[PDB]
């Protein structure tokens, strides 16, 4: 159940672990490219917000699903912020989204008055006007229903074949984590010089009980030097001060 690009869907991924284990290496994908984190490290990180955008586009439109890349699909249907963190995943889908006479179940917005801002999902069907006469719901001349289906066919050129695109968008550890790659825990060690990882904030120091309180949504703090001052332990939620090793 992939969406028309003009009305791309989105699902939230939360309160779960792993499956960032370079799944793309199964080579079922025509392309896989990350704009933030290098793919092999995704499975070592924790995230606070993970979402998957799901839609079908033509092969020559795959190149438009990128930060900084303009064009009608990029501007009228699905748009990424240029400051994008996430990975764009895509594959050929002729076995599902193509028909001999054309698979017309997927709509594109071709006619629009203005460009989208990041992640705006405009599902409006207002007839588009392109001229001095109002053409109010007429269809023809200066106005058209904004959406057009494309007849995907198994025999068309590759750029005209359907591709399924999933964009995995995410935030980094600037809040308590909800989604993590697979990790093996070890016990909390207090005092002594210890190398720690938690949800990230990797470093070495001496962990002692803190006399601090954090607001419920803060997870960790920062010093004037922008280094972690203290962290909350993901398990049991004690606040630990990180002092330097002598």
């Amino acid at each position, epitope marked *: 159940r992939f969406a028309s690009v003009y009305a791309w869907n989105r699902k939230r991924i939360s309160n779960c672990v792993a499956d960032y284990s370079v799944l793309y290496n199964s080579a079922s994908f025509s392309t896989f490219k990350c704009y933030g984190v290098c793919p092999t490290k995704l499975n070592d990180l924790c995230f606070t917000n993970v979402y998957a955008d799901s839609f079908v586009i033509r092969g020559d439109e795959v190149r438009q699903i990128a930060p900084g890349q303009t064009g009608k699909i990029a501007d009228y249907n699905y748009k990424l912020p240029d400051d994008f963190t996430g990975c764009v995943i895509a594959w050929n889908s002729n076995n599902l989204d193509s028909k001999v006479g054309g698979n017309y179940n997927y709509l594109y917005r*071709l006619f629009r008055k203005s460009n989208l801002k990041p992640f705006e999902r405009d599902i409006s069907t207002e007839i588009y006007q*392109a*001229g001095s*006469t109002p053409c109010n719901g007429v*269809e*023809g*001349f*200066n106005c*058209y229903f904004p959406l*057009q289906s494309y007849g995907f066919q198994p025999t068309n050129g590759v750029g005209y074949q359907p591709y399924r695109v999933v964009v995995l968008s995410f935030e980094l550890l600037h809040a308590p984590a909800t989604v993590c790659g697979p990790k093996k825990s070890t016990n909390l060690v207090k005092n002594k010089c210890v190398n720690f990882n938690f949800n990230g904030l990797t470093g070495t120091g001496v962990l002692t009980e803190s006399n601090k309180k954090f607001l419920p949504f803060q997870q960790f703090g920062r010093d004037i030097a922008d280094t972690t001052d203290a962290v909350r332990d993901p398990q049991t939620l004690e606040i630990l001060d990180i002092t330097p090793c002598s």
Partner: antibody
Amino acid sequence: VQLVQSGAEVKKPGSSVKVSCKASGGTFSSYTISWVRQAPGQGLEWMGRIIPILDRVMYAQKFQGRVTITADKSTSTAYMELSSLRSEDTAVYYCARRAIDSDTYVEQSHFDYWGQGTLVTV
Amino acid sequence: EIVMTQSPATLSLSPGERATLSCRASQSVSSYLAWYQQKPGQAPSLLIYDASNRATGIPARFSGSGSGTDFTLTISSLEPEDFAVYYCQQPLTFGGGTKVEIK
């Protein structure tokens, strides 16, 4: 670019008139084709316009239901069908090119090249 | 459709005289008019598009004017070969037409 149409025909009442105009060169990817009827003793009566690019056809209210337009995907082939031919509906009818377009979809405001036509009767 | 009325039903003038042909809409069409010249045995050809803007291949004697609902076709000097029936067309359909005859 071109408006190469069919020859003339005579047929049984109720039968469909199925003819097409073929436009070569760059017509397919640009300009659309409009069908108009030169009824005798009258002015021209526009019937409809086909746009193979947008998968759309525009129609005169006068000819809705009876006129439908089909087209191919290579040579722009404006395959107009007039259902239910009546003997009183005897006319020379033809295709014309709508020479104005844009990528901003102002599309077709007017005509340029007209093909004159062929006669259909009973 | 867009309903247009033309006037006179028949215009009567001598060759060399100016011919003025009227077309009036029930609704505004901005500048979207075309004018055409019909002859016995010939479907009318394009003279003007965009109300006043002369069509390619058409002699300078033809021009138009008007906007909104009120339009005119002017032939500055009608030639003996121009005693045609003239028509207006809106984005969609044609008006009634004016026959032009020699006085």
